[PDB]
């Protein structure tokens, strides 16, 4: 799912 991709984008986020 796109929802799982969104999860992963958030897990790995580093601004």
């Amino acid at each position: 799912g796109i929802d799982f991709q969104d999860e992963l984008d958030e897990f790995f986020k580093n601004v």
Partner: antibody
Amino acid sequence: VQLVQSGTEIKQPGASVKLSCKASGYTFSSDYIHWVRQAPGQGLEWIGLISPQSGNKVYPQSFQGRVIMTTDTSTSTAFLDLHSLRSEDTAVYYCTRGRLDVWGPGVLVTVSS
Amino acid sequence: SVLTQPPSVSAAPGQKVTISCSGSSSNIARSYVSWHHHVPGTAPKVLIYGTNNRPSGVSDRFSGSKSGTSAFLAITGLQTGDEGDYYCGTWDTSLSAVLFGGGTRLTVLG
């Protein structure tokens, strides 16, 4: 905090292989398990990741179609099933935790006639 | 869609080296960066995760940082044990995948 891996595998081209990754101890739910390989003389290549909690997975375009990652009832016990093996797939396969902070010890898969 | 690294770096013992890693706005600019040291014959060693965290036991002369689409590993106090290949890794949101650089081979001169 560590990962233990199944042992070495020898396969014919065309064959498939199923590799296993297990956390050494106990974990609070899970983040993710990655698989990464390294062919002799080459660099690191990501094969995909799976949540041992939910079983949701993602694979890169380069491996989509040839790979199945599965988990069981456990919070830390993932599997990689690699199909349609070719000489090019000879490599050491590694599993890692979710932040790539902890790596399993590798297992060699040799594809040979 | 690809991560690039210089093919090699070199310094004399005791000096500092910095290893470069270049990506794009969909990966390095926005995702954690990890660094790994591999000596053919041995499993790769994690040196940096979460862009600047060192695993327990990793020497404090290694450090990670990031600026825009570029990430950097600095090694101070260079010793012969530091020789080998260094790979950066990061998550790309447009691809939904982990990318690895091509690796940088470090040589201790002299």
